Design an enzyme around this catalytic site. Structure first.
Site, PDB file in Angstrom:
ATOM      1  CG  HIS A 231      -1.898  -1.218   1.045  1.00  0.00           C
ATOM      2  ND1 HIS A 231      -2.732  -1.468   0.319  1.00  0.00           N
ATOM      3  CD2 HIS A 231      -2.370  -1.952   2.289  1.00  0.00           C
ATOM      4  CE1 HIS A 231      -3.794  -2.447   0.635  1.00  0.00           C
ATOM      5  NE2 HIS A 231      -3.409  -2.647   1.885  1.00  0.00           N
TER       6      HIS A 231
ATOM      7  CG  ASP B 144      -2.309  -8.422   0.860  1.00  0.00           C
ATOM      8  OD1 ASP B 144      -3.670  -7.937   0.966  1.00  0.00           O
ATOM      9  OD2 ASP B 144      -1.717  -8.724   1.890  1.00  0.00           O
TER      10      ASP B 144
ATOM     11  CG  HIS C 191      -6.465  -5.609   1.704  1.00  0.00           C
ATOM     12  ND1 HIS C 191      -5.964  -6.341   2.431  1.00  0.00           N
ATOM     13  CD2 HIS C 191      -7.652  -5.178   2.189  1.00  0.00           C
ATOM     14  CE1 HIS C 191      -6.827  -6.712   3.694  1.00  0.00           C
ATOM     15  NE2 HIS C 191      -7.845  -6.011   3.279  1.00  0.00           N
TER      16      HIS C 191
ATOM     17  CG  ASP D  89      -4.414 -10.309   3.597  1.00  0.00           C
ATOM     18  OD1 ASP D  89      -4.227 -10.770   2.444  1.00  0.00           O
ATOM     19  OD2 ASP D  89      -4.372  -8.980   3.803  1.00  0.00           O
TER      20      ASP D  89
ATOM     21  CE1 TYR E 112      -2.332  -8.191   8.978  1.00  0.00           C
ATOM     22  CE2 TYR E 112      -3.973  -8.662   7.462  1.00  0.00           C
ATOM     23  CZ  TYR E 112      -2.778  -7.832   7.701  1.00  0.00           C
ATOM     24  OH  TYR E 112      -2.539  -6.888   7.028  1.00  0.00           O
TER      25      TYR E 112
HETATM   26  C1  LIG Z   1      -0.437  -4.556   4.029  1.00  0.00           C
HETATM   27  C2  LIG Z   1      -1.110  -5.949   3.486  1.00  0.00           C
HETATM   28  N1  LIG Z   1      -2.732  -5.602   2.900  1.00  0.00           N
HETATM   29  N2  LIG Z   1      -3.399  -4.679   3.505  1.00  0.00           N
HETATM   30  C3  LIG Z   1      -4.262  -5.250   4.645  1.00  0.00           C
HETATM   31  O1  LIG Z   1      -4.048  -6.420   4.996  1.00  0.00           O
HETATM   32  C4  LIG Z   1      -4.965  -4.246   5.566  1.00  0.00           C
HETATM   33  C5  LIG Z   1      -4.700  -2.866   5.563  1.00  0.00           C
HETATM   34  C6  LIG Z   1      -5.346  -1.930   6.235  1.00  0.00           C
HETATM   35  C7  LIG Z   1      -6.447  -2.510   7.064  1.00  0.00           C
HETATM   36  C8  LIG Z   1      -6.982  -1.517   8.032  1.00  0.00           C
HETATM   37  N3  LIG Z   1      -8.665  -1.882   7.769  1.00  0.00           N
HETATM   38  C9  LIG Z   1      -9.403  -1.520   6.455  1.00  0.00           C
HETATM   39  C10 LIG Z   1     -10.509  -0.753   6.359  1.00  0.00           C
HETATM   40  O2  LIG Z   1     -11.255  -0.868   5.746  1.00  0.00           O
HETATM   41  N4  LIG Z   1     -10.363   0.259   7.626  1.00  0.00           N
HETATM   42  C11 LIG Z   1     -11.630   1.405   7.572  1.00  0.00           C
HETATM   43  C12 LIG Z   1     -12.731   0.756   8.447  1.00  0.00           C
HETATM   44  C13 LIG Z   1     -13.109  -0.268   8.908  1.00  0.00           C
HETATM   45  C14 LIG Z   1     -14.146  -0.717   9.761  1.00  0.00           C
HETATM   46  C15 LIG Z   1     -14.849   0.183  10.220  1.00  0.00           C
HETATM   47  C16 LIG Z   1     -14.531   1.583   9.733  1.00  0.00           C
HETATM   48  C17 LIG Z   1     -13.246   1.987   8.930  1.00  0.00           C
HETATM   49  C18 LIG Z   1      -9.421  -2.593   8.943  1.00  0.00           C
HETATM   50  O3  LIG Z   1     -10.396  -2.724   8.375  1.00  0.00           O
HETATM   51  C19 LIG Z   1      -9.041  -2.591  10.216  1.00  0.00           C
HETATM   52  C20 LIG Z   1      -8.449  -1.826  11.081  1.00  0.00           C
HETATM   53  C21 LIG Z   1      -8.034  -2.002  12.345  1.00  0.00           C
HETATM   54  C22 LIG Z   1      -8.400  -3.279  12.738  1.00  0.00           C
HETATM   55  N5  LIG Z   1      -8.162  -3.741  14.231  1.00  0.00           N
HETATM   56  C23 LIG Z   1      -7.438  -2.644  15.182  1.00  0.00           C
HETATM   57  C24 LIG Z   1      -8.623  -4.821  14.919  1.00  0.00           C
HETATM   58  C25 LIG Z   1      -9.059  -4.410  12.098  1.00  0.00           C
HETATM   59  C26 LIG Z   1      -9.509  -4.079  10.481  1.00  0.00           C
HETATM   60  C27 LIG Z   1      -6.418  -3.926   7.241  1.00  0.00           C
HETATM   61  C28 LIG Z   1      -6.106  -4.749   6.415  1.00  0.00           C
HETATM   62  K   LIG Z   2      -3.600  -8.308  -4.331  1.00  0.00           K
HETATM   63 ZN   LIG Z   3      -3.654  -7.394   3.004  1.00  0.00          ZN
END
Ligand SMILES: CCNNC(=O)c1ccc(CN(CC(=O)NCc2ccccc2)C(=O)c2ccc(N(C)C)cc2)cc1
Ligand SMILES: [K+]
Ligand SMILES: [Zn+2]
Ligand SMILES: [K+]
Length: 357
Positions: free
Chosen positions: A133, A171, A173, A264, A304
């Site tokens: 990213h 990945d 994403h 993931d 994760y």
């Molecule tokens: C680098 C490898 N590829 N990238 C990833 O793997 C990856 C990158 C970023 C994220 C962060 N995001 C994505 C998102 O949409 N955020 C907006 C959001 C979500 C839910 C409600 C309001 C707003 C989470 O959802 C998240 C964040 C924190 C979390 N904790 C602390 C349990 C769990 C999920 C997750 C995965």
């Molecule tokens: K990908």
């Molecule tokens: Zn990812």
């Protein structure tokens, strides 16, 4: 045929000091490494040392302002680190984050050099923080510097500017940073499979759709395979490889394959929502080994579930080591929306790839 492996426990120093349960955990890499030991895979590999990337190497893909800002975090106190991290989308920073990002990139540079000079045939890099990213000018989504993109440019710097590099990003994403870095480039073919959901899934941009095929001389060299409306798994990923990834990749004929290997999309992941199995990842790895005379570097991105990522990445290393791939059913019908996605990509890319016509 030797397989290299790089892992340095120092990369565990990067941590979230305000949420000890944040999913991008230090022990992601130690669990993968210890599973390689338990499965007796580590002793079959040639250990490649980690090193720090240099600032000059970071400038292969990143702006001087971005490098300087992340570099400055090494000397920041907690509340200043929190303020800096909060300015980005989905980033936490500690005073070891910069060093860990440098070690992740340098580890991959040493692995790419070992492959391209014939010291090893292929290699696995158990690294964090992830990279895909990260953009030229900003951090994002747990990523500071774009390790895979930097490794492609590093590889070119030690061979030829024209070295054909394929980056396959499995990945769950979209690797927005990797796409953007290479969008106008025909020397680096970027192929991403990712959960898209009509732009609603992180990183929440229509840049990830199938109609973004590249720009200028790069038209045709950016292949987005976006999934909508379905819990995708082995049948869909195998079909995407059969109909798209492998025909395009064989026509491109890369000289080095980098895998942005997030786990993931794995069964059990707490946020991906998909169900690729360890055997599925083995199948994909074994397919990629038919490219570039086997010169494949697998780089950890996301993923994760500590058990899922440990089993999945270990299965990939087993493939690199020459073990026979598990037999899978290529006749399981695909979920209907996956056929729609694959056909959309085929229509977008048929003009650029004779293998699709
Ligand atoms: C680098 C490898 N590829 N990238 C990833 O793997 C990856 C990158 C970023 C994220 C962060 N995001 C994505 C998102 O949409 N955020 C907006 C959001 C979500 C839910 C409600 C309001 C707003 C989470 O959802 C998240 C964040 C924190 C979390 N904790 C602390 C349990 C769990 C999920 C997750 C995965
Ligand atoms: K990908
Ligand atoms: Zn990812
Ligand atoms: K490209």
């Amino acid at each position: 045929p030797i397989t290299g492996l790089v892992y340095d426990q120092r990369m565990m120093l990067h941590h979230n000091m305000w949420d000890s349960h944040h999913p991008e955990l230090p022990q992601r890499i130690s669990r993968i490494f210890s599973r390689h030991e338990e499965l007796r895979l580590l002793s079959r590999c040639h250990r490649i040392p980690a090193r720090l990337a240099t600032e000059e190497e970071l400038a292969l893909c990143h702006s001087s302002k971005h490098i300087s800002i992340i570099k400055s975090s090494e000397h920041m106190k907690p509340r200043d680190l929190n303020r800096l991290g909060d300015e980005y989308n989905s980033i936490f920073i500690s005073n070891e984050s910069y060093t860990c990002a440098l070690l992740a990139a340098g580890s991959c540079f040493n692995s790419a050099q070992a492959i391209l000079t014939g010291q090893v045939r292929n290699a696995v890099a158990i690294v964090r923080p992830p990279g895909h990213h990260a953009e030229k000018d900003t951090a994002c989504g747990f990523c500071f510097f774009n390790t895979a993109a930097l490794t492609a440019r590093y590889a070119q710097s030690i061979t030829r500017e024209s070295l054909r590099v394929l980056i396959v990003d499995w990945d769950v994403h979209h690797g927005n940073g990797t796409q953007h870095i290479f969008e106008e480039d025909d020397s680096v073919l970027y192929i991403s499979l990712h959960r898209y959901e009509d732009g609603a899934f992180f990183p929440n941009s229509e840049d990830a759709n199938y109609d973004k095929v590249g720009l200028g001389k790069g038209r045709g060299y950016n292949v987005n395979i976006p999934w909508n409306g379905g819990k995708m798994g082995d049948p869909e990923y195998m079909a995407a490889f059969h109909h798209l990834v492998m025909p395009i990749a064989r026509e491109f004929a890369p000289e080095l394959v980098l895998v942005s290997a997030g786990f993931d999309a794995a069964r059990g992941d707490p946020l991906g929502g998909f169900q690729v199995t360890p055997e599925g990842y083995a199948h994909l790895t074994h397919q990629l080994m038919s490219l570039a005379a086997g010169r494949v570097l697998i780089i950890l991105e996301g993923g994760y579930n500590l058990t899922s990522i440990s089993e999945s990445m270990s299965m990939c290393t087993s493939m690199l080591l020459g073990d026979s791939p598990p037999s899978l059913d290529h006749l399981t019908p695909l979920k209907t929306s996956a056929t729609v996605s694959i056909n959309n990509v085929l229509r977008a890319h048929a003009p650029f790839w004779s293998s699709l016509r």
